[model samples]
Target: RCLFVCRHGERMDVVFGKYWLSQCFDAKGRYIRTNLNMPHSLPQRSGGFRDYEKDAPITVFGCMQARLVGEALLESNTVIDHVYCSPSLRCVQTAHNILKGLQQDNHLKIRVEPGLFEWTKWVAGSTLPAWIPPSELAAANLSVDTTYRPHIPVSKLAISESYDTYINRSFQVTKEIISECKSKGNNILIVAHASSLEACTCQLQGLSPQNSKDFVQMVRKIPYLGFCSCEELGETGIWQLTDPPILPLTHGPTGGFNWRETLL
Candidate 1:
C-alpha cells in the first residue's frame, strides 16, 4: 500500500510567527479567547508585520508549496488513488492546488476530513495560575516547541495537557487512515501539520515520545517529499518498517528532474 503524508502549505500567519507558539495570550497577559465550536483561526494582531488579513486563508507562498508537493508526487511511480485533507481552509486549498498542479483533474478526488486536522492545543482564555512568571509566559508564547515550560508554578500547573496527548491523538488518526487506505487498495495522501506528521511517524516506528527531537530527525530522513514503502509482517500481522525505496523520479529518462524546477 502507498502512504503519503505532508504538512500543509505555509500560512501568512506562519511567516509572521503568529501561530508558531503553543498558546496565545491577550493584551492583559491572559490566554486569548479561542472558538472551540469551529476550526481555529489566527487571531487579529494590532500592527506588527501580519501577512494576510486576520483569519484569511492561504497565501501565495502556501500555494507554491502545494504545487511543489504535487510536482514531487507526480514524478513518483506510486499510483495515488485518494487525496485527503483537513477541513481547514489552508489544507483544503493545499490539496486543491496540488491536484491542479499534478494535472489529475478528471480522475482524482479530494476528501475533506475534519479528523485529520492539526493537533489540538489548549483552548485560549483558560485560567492560568498566579505563580507563572511573566517572562516564562512570554517565552512560551513565542516558542514553537509545544513542550516548552519554565520554572513558574502557575504556568506549570496551567499546562494541564502535555504534548504527548496531541502526539497520541495524531498517531491514532494516522493509523486509522493507513488502515482504510490498505483495505481499499488505494494510495493515501494526507495534508496535515508538522506535529501530526511527527507523531504519526513516531508511532509507526515504535519510538519513545519523550525523544521528540530524535523522532523528528528520523522523520526528516524518511523522504518528506517522496514515497517510502513499508509492509505488515506475517503470523501475528504486525506492520514492520522497511528501507525507503528509490523514487521513480530518480530513475527517469533524463537523470531525474531538478528539485528547483519542480517548484516553478
Candidate 2:
C-alpha cells in the first residue's frame, strides 16, 4: 500500500530565459542517464524536451511527463486505488494524463486536499498563486468523476499557513490517510509538490525533525515522471527509506530508542 509521491513536471520557467536547455534531463538537473542513450530520453531529445503547449496551469509537456510516469506505474503493477492530489491545476493535469496512460477504469478516485499543497512554492519566480476552482475542472477537459468531491474549504484560499503548522499537520494527516486506505486498493498516490510530498514521506517513515534543516535533509530530489517509490512496512502503508539515511548522527525515524540514543 506504499504510495508513489511525485512532483508535477518540468515547468516553463527556465524556458523564457536566456539559458541553454537540454532535451534530456534528470531530477538533479543532470544530463546523465545510465545507458538508455541520452538521445532517447524525452521528446526525441532533438527538439525541446518538454515540447508541448500549456493548457491553463498545465503545460502539454507536463501532461506527457505524467503519462510516462503512468506507464512506469503500470509496469510496476502499482495500484491506483485513489489519488490524494493537490488542488493545483498542474497536479490535476498530471493525474489526468496518468489515468489516461494507465487506462485503468478502476474508477480511481481523486480528492483535492489542501493538506497536500506545498507550504511555499516558486513557479518561474512567482509565489504560490491562486488555484483553479473545482467547479471549472470539467471545463478544463480533465476527467474528474461526477461523484468525486474535493475536501478543500473556502477559507483555505486566502489563508497563509506558517511553515511549522504546514509541516506538522501535513505529516500527521498524510500518514493517517495512507493508513486508513490500506483496506482499499492499498496503493495510493499523492500528486503534490516536493515539500509536501517530502513531509508526507517523513510522516510515513515516522521521522521527527531534530533541526530546521532535518526535514529537507531527509528527502531526496523527486524527479519529474519519476515518482518517489517505496515499499510497505509490514502490511501497513507506513514506509521506510530502503537505506535509512545517516543524518548528522541519526538512526531510525524516531531518532532511535532510549537505549539507542544513549549510545550517541
Candidate 3:
C-alpha cells in the first residue's frame, strides 16, 4: 500500500498568522495557486508589505508531530523505503523527524520536489519561499535526516508554472513515484503541504474533489499529521482512510525537553 502525509507543525509563516490552508484554494478549486512568487523584494520584522512576512520557524508542536509519527510507524513495523518531500523548510523538518522515527537514515534519502506548492491569483504566501536556497537549508541542520540522499535532482523553481499546471504536475510526479514503489514492492511516503496531498489522494483513490466543501473538508489542521494506505487490488488499487492515523494527542510545547534553540 502507498502512504501519504500532510505537513504540519507550525511554520515560520503560520506562526505569525500570515498563512493558512484556506489561502491555498478558493472555495471553488477554480484556481490552483502555485508558489512561483519571486525572490526577496524587501526587509522583515514584518508586515504584509515584507516579502517574507509570512515565513516563520516551526514551533515545538510541529517538531513533536514529526518525531511522534516516526516512532509510531516504527512500533507498528511499517517500512517506508522512500519519502518524497516538498522542498519547503517545514516539510524538510518533517522529513528529518520521520527518518529519525523510522531509524532508516541515509538508506532512503529525502527526494525533494519543487512541487506540493500553491496556486493562487494574488501573490500571497506559498508552500515555497523561493529565496531559501538549498545551501541555506543544508546549513540550518533542518532536514530530519542528514544522511538520507534525494533520489531525483531537485530543480530550481520555475516561474512559468501556474496552479492548474502544478496540480497536473502533482499527479504526474506522485503517480510516477508510486509506479516505482510498486516495481520494488516497497512502501513509499510523501511529506508535503496540507492541500497538495488531498488532491493527490483524490486522484489515487479515484475520488473527485468535485465540490468546494468536498475538498475543503479534506484540509487538515496546523501540526496535523496523517496518512492513508493504498492497497494494490490488482491493476486498480484502493486507498484506505478508515485505518486512523497515529498523531500527537496534544498541541505545542508538551514541556520538559528544554526548549533550546528551536529544536534544530
The true-versus-predicted C-alpha distance at residue 47 of model 2, in Å, is 34
Which of 1 and 3 is the better model by TM-score?
A: 3
lDDT of 2 by residue, 20-139 (tens): 243334554544333221222222211223322221234455666777777766766666787767766567767777777677524564666666776543222333444555555554
Stretches of candidate 3 off by over 4 Å are: 16-55, 120-128, 143-163, 212-214, 220-223, 234-264
lDDT of 1 by residue, 1-264 (tens): 545666666564444355522233445543333322112333233332122223334555566667665776676655667776654545666676677667774556565554554433433344321221223322323111123221212222323455666577556766776766666765677765555455655666576675656655654553213333344555655555454333332212112245698976
lDDT of each: 0.50, 0.56, 0.55
Ranking by TM-score: 3, 2, 1
Tens-place lDDT digits, model 3, residues 74-178: 887777877877665567667777777777654666766555544332224443344344455555554443443433333534445554554566666667778
Q: After superposition, how far is residue 228 of candidate 1 from its true place, in Å?
A: 7.1
lDDT of 1: 0.50
TM-score, structure 2 vs. true: 0.65
**Model 1 regions lying over 4 Å from their true place:** 16-56, 122-162, 211-264
Whole-model alpha-carbon lDDT for candidate 2? 0.56
The candidate that wins on TM-score is 3
